[PDB]
């Protein structure tokens, strides 16, 4: 895996791909 | 209304919620 | 949950707001 | 709903989500 | 218009509703 | 050729049409 | 319409150009 | 077809749409 | 694990591979 | 190929790395 | 946090793993 | 190359055709 630059909707796409059926929390500062 | 599934469901959550944040929990 | 309401069934953006923090 | 910053393909995704089966016109200036 | 507002600034989903059929 | 549906169909329209604009009309 | 030609059936990017303004 | 400004994931989406079942190589410099 | 198809499969490849580049070959 | 392993079946991001250049 | 790191800088998929259930 | 042209500048779908199998 590479380091990624991920803003906005791209970040939540990445979380979806990583977490899958486990689900995830999106929590911006 | 539309069916929103997987990556499309979370992009709709981002849209609606934005910097409020959100939770995506299939198991719920 | 969300998958049942929005993916299996259909839902509005208003319904989607229920999953906001 | 929050205010959104939406450029290019992200704007048309948003229009798709809002308008749904109603359809929509994409008309940049 | 609202289109350009969205990208240079911010816009609401309500504003986008103006573009539906 | 591919099947292009929903959000994928409009992103293909954006790509092809760009600043010409486009119409997406399922009812048509 | 577009859904029948491009989603139900398949279509080329050339066919897609028919929906440009 | 119009000229397009395409970075990152948007470029690979475009390659997918153009190439289809033919497949493609993504090769950044 | 999830099913990753079409445009979703290549965006997952971009994510994982990045500036390493990748190949998408359905015929393989 | 990738379609069989990742789309038809399922695969991990580790499996996806096998298609990196 | 990692969220902001991702957008202002870079982040790993490993870091994103911290946000799963 | 064309890849970098696309992001720093603009490119055509025709140019992208050069990357298909
Ligand atoms: Cl972007
Ligand atoms: Cl899909
Ligand atoms: Zn983007
Ligand atoms: Zn999809």
Residue numbers in the entry:
A (entry chain B), D (entry chain B), H (entry chain B): 1 to 29
B (entry chain D), F (entry chain D), I (entry chain D): 3 to 30
C (entry chain C), E (entry chain A), G (entry chain C), J (entry chain C), K (entry chain A), L (entry chain A): 1 to 21
Relevant lines from the article:
For insulin, we also compared the electron diffraction results with X-ray diffraction results obtained from micrometre-sized crystals obtained from the same preparation.
The structure of bovine insulin was determined by both X-ray and electron diffraction using crystals from the same batch, i.e. grown under the exact same conditions. The X-ray structure was refined at 2.3 Å resolution, which was sufficient to yield a reference structure for the electron diffraction structure. The asymmetric unit contains two insulin molecules as well as two zinc ions and two chloride ions located on the crystallographic threefold axis and 23 water molecules. The electron density of these insulin crystals is well defined for all amino acids except for residue 30 of chain B and residues 1 and 2 of chain D. In our insulin X-ray structure, a zinc ion was observed in both chains (B and D) at full occupancy. The zinc B factor (28.8 and 27.8 Å2) is similar to that of His10 NE2 (27.8 and 28.5 Å2). The similarity of the B factors of zinc and His10 suggests strong binding of the zinc ion. The insulin structure refined against electron diffraction data at 3.25 Å resolution agrees well with the X-ray structure refined at 2.3 Å resolution in this study (r.m.s.d. of 0.38 Å on Cα atoms).
